[PDB]
Design an enzyme around this catalytic site. Structure first.
Site, short mmCIF file in Angstrom:
data_model
loop_
_atom_site.label_atom_id
_atom_site.label_comp_id
_atom_site.label_asym_id
_atom_site.label_seq_id
_atom_site.Cartn_x
_atom_site.Cartn_y
_atom_site.Cartn_z
N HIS A 1 -72.41 -5.33 2.61
CA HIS A 1 -72.87 -5.15 1.23
C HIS A 1 -71.84 -4.41 0.39
CE1 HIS A 1 -76.75 -6.96 0.94
NE2 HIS A 1 -77.32 -6.20 1.86
N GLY B 1 -82.20 -0.94 6.85
CA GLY B 1 -80.91 -0.61 6.29
C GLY B 1 -80.89 -0.82 4.79
N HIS C 1 -74.29 -5.30 8.67
CA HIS C 1 -74.97 -5.91 7.53
C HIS C 1 -74.80 -5.02 6.29
CE1 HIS C 1 -78.65 -8.13 5.82
NE2 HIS C 1 -78.40 -7.17 4.94
N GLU C 2 -74.99 -3.71 6.44
CA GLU C 2 -74.84 -2.81 5.29
C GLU C 2 -73.39 -2.67 4.83
OE1 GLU C 2 -77.54 -2.37 3.95
OE2 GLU C 2 -78.66 -2.87 5.76
N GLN D 1 -77.06 -2.52 -3.57
CA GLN D 1 -78.38 -3.12 -3.75
C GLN D 1 -79.21 -2.41 -4.82
OE1 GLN D 1 -79.26 -3.14 0.71
NE2 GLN D 1 -80.09 -5.15 0.13
N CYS E 1 -82.65 -10.32 3.88
CA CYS E 1 -82.06 -9.31 3.02
C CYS E 1 -82.98 -8.95 1.86
CB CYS E 1 -80.71 -9.80 2.47
SG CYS E 1 -79.79 -8.60 1.47
N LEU E 2 -83.12 -7.66 1.61
CA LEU E 2 -83.98 -7.16 0.53
C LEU E 2 -83.58 -7.72 -0.82
CD1 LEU E 2 -84.15 -3.44 1.67
CD2 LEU E 2 -85.93 -5.20 1.91
O1 LIG Z 1 -79.27 -4.33 3.05
C1 LIG Z 1 -80.37 -4.31 3.94
N1 LIG Z 1 -81.44 -5.15 3.88
O2 LIG Z 1 -81.53 -6.13 2.89
C2 LIG Z 1 -82.50 -5.01 4.88
C3 LIG Z 1 -82.19 -5.92 6.08
C4 LIG Z 1 -81.59 -5.14 7.26
C5 LIG Z 1 -81.25 -6.02 8.43
C6 LIG Z 1 -82.26 -6.81 9.07
C7 LIG Z 1 -81.96 -7.65 10.18
C8 LIG Z 1 -80.65 -7.72 10.69
C9 LIG Z 1 -79.55 -6.86 10.00
C10 LIG Z 1 -79.91 -6.05 8.91
NI NI Z 2 -79.14 -6.73 2.93
#
Ligand SMILES: OCN(O)CCCc1ccccc1
Ligand code: NI
Length: 194
Positions: free
Chosen positions: A168, A71, A164-165, A76, A121-122
């Site tokens: 953000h 995601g 999660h997105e 970001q 998170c990235l």
């Molecule tokens: O914004 C997205 N990102 O940093 C990548 C992580 C995506 C994600 C991974 C595990 C559980 C929910 C979401």
């Molecule tokens: Ni994230």
């Protein structure tokens, strides 16, 4: 301009385009996009998805020094727009593949859920253990690149990823939903996924 350079035809998104904790943008509420979308807004969505695919490819991720992701949200990339891309693989090739404009949760379950492994998170360069408490199920409304409205119901991993997105674009980080006192406490009504 972030969106300007990222939308250039030759540009390939990589970790250098992703901002990390500390950058105010990640704690700011993203502005909704208006329709019709500009060519740049459509390309951005496409660039984001391309990034996700690259990050999921062994050789690609290696060469580009990419962290794997399922995601990504515009903030970001230092672009404060309500745009997100989700690419959840099945264990077709994907359980969920979508570029969402102005996504919104219009309904959610009382029951909560969290990945047993927790979340990363990235934009966060460190491991934060704990159960990220989220809605087990959600109904999400969003618009595609053509301005068409979509209403979908998600559960399991897809539900977690989309939330999660969306967080953000609302200036929320995953660790904001972990129980401070007991990071791995299992409250009543909490569904641990695994
Ligand atoms: O914004 C997205 N990102 O940093 C990548 C992580 C995506 C994600 C991974 C595990 C559980 C929910 C979401
Ligand atoms: Ni994230």
């Amino acid at each position: 301009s972030a969106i300007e350079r990222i939308s250039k035809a030759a540009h390939l998104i990589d970790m250098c385009d992703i901002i990390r904790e500390g950058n105010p943008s990640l704690r700011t509420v993203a502005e909704e996009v208006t329709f019709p979308l500009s060519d740049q807004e459509i390309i951005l969505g496409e660039k984001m998805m391309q990034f996700l695919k690259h990050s999921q490819d062994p050789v690609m991720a290696e060469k580009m020094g990419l962290r794997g992701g399922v995601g990504l949200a515009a903030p970001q990339l230092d672009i404060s727009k309500r745009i997100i891309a989700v690419l959840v693989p099945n264990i077709e090739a994907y359980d969920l593949e979508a570029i969402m404009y102005n996504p919104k949760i219009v309904s959610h379950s009382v029951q909560d859920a969290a990945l047993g492994e927790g979340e990363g998170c990235l934009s966060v360069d460190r491991n934060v253990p704990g159960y990220v408490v989220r809605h087990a199920r959600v109904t999400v409304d969003y618009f595609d690149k053509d301005g068409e409205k979509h209403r979908i119901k998600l559960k399991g991993y897809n539900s977690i990823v989309v939330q999660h997105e969306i967080d953000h674009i609302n200036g929320i980080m995953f660790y904001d939903r972990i129980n401070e006192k007991d990071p791995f406490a299992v409250k009543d009504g909490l569904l641990i996924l695994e």
